[PDB]
Amino acid sequence: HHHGTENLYFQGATMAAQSLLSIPVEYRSQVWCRANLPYPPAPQLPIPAVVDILTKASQALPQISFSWTLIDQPPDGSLFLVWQAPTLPSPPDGMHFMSNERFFNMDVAGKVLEIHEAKHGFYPLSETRTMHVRCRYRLLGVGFDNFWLVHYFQGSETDSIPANISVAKPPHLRRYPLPDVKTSPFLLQE
Ligand SMILES: [Cl-]
């Protein structure tokens, strides 16, 4: 592949680039850059709570480390802070969806909150119906544009529909078992 868009995001991010180059080439497309916290698990969050969590993360960023790691079939409640370019695809998480991720925008205190909501989530190895929701959030205009809250939680009984990997997104099952890929921590601000 060529790396023009990636390279745009690793300008001036040397530590994160160095950590990625330590990973075998085949797995570099598979890893998430996730914060070493961990966030307590939570049910579906109100919008003001999301805004606060991302504001606090932006203010704490020089004291928070990240690692490149695989994420696979996280339990309901799982909350991650992740670094991702809005123009690159998300790495795999082991979740498939029977519908398209929908994109909503909310004005909050003169800022934009992006909500990317993927209902009808399922784990094809263990589920014949949809049981999960994934939300990716980010808050624009506060100097934290490339940082996301990613939330996995329980779907409603009313939203559960028959699931089949043959018509789901993504269409391809990931290779199991997963290799051991977790880098030692690095910083994204100094
Ligand atoms: Cl749809």
Q: What is the DSSP letter of 123?
A: -
Residue 81 CA: distances (Å) to CA of 26, 34, 132: 24, 6, 19
Residue 120 CA: distances (Å) to CA of 72, 96, 99, 162: 17, 8, 6, 9
Q: Read off the tokens for 131.
A: 């049981």
Structural domain count, the chain: 1
The C-alpha atoms of residue 109 and residue 140 are separated, in whole angstroms, by: 11
The C-alpha atoms of residue 88 and residue 177 are separated, in whole angstroms, by: 25
The residue to which tokens 């601000």 are assigned: 189
Q: What is the DSSP letter of 62?
A: G
Q: 97 CA distance to ligand 1 centroid (A)?
A: 10
User: Dihedral, CA atoms, 18, 21, 27, 28, nearest 10 degrees?
Assistant: 60
Q: Read off the tokens for 180.
A: 């051991």
CA atoms within 13 A on the CB side of 55: 11
User: Using an 8 Å Cβ cutoff, are 69 and 34 in contact?
Assistant: yes
Residue 119 CA: distances (Å) to CA of 160, 164, 187: 9, 15, 33
The DSSP bridge partners found for residue 147 are 83
Q: Please tell me what resolution, in angstroms, this structure has.
A: 2.1
Task: Tally Cβ neighbours within 10 Å of residue 111.
Answer: 14
Helix (H, G, I), strand (E, B) or coil at 53: helix
Q: Read off the tokens for 66.
A: 């990240």
User: Dihedral, CA atoms, 42, 43, 44, 46, nearest 10 degrees?
Assistant: -70
Residues shown for the chain: 190
Task: Give the domain extent around 98.
Answer: 4-187
The C-alpha atoms of residue 88 and residue 157 are separated, in whole angstroms, by: 33
Widest CA span of the chain, in angstroms? Answer: 48
User: Using an 8 Å Cβ cutoff, are 113 and 50 in contact?
Assistant: yes
Of 66, 70, 78, nearest in space to 147 by CA: 66
Q: 101 CA distance to ligand 1 centroid (A)?
A: 7
How far is C-alpha 106 from the geometric centre of its chain's CA atoms?
Answer: 19
Task: Tally Cβ neighbours within 10 Å of residue 4.
Answer: 7
Obtained via which technique?
A: X-ray
Q: 142 CA distance to ligand 1 centroid (A)?
A: 31
Q: 111 CA distance to ligand 1 centroid (A)?
A: 27
Q: Using only the alpha carbons of the chain, give its radius of gyration.
A: 17
Q: 140 CA distance to ligand 1 centroid (A)?
A: 26
Q: 160 CA distance to ligand 1 centroid (A)?
A: 14
Which positions ≥6 away from 76 have C-beta within 8 Å? 41, 132, 152, 153, 154
Which positions ≥6 away from 29 have C-beta within 8 Å? 91
The C-alpha atoms of residue 36 and residue 38 are separated, in whole angstroms, by: 6
Q: Read off the tokens for 55.
A: 């504001």
Q: Read off the tokens for 89.
A: 């695809």
The residue to which tokens 């497309």 are assigned: 29
How far does the chain reach from its first CA to its final CA, in angstroms? 31
Q: 99 CA distance to ligand 1 centroid (A)?
A: 4
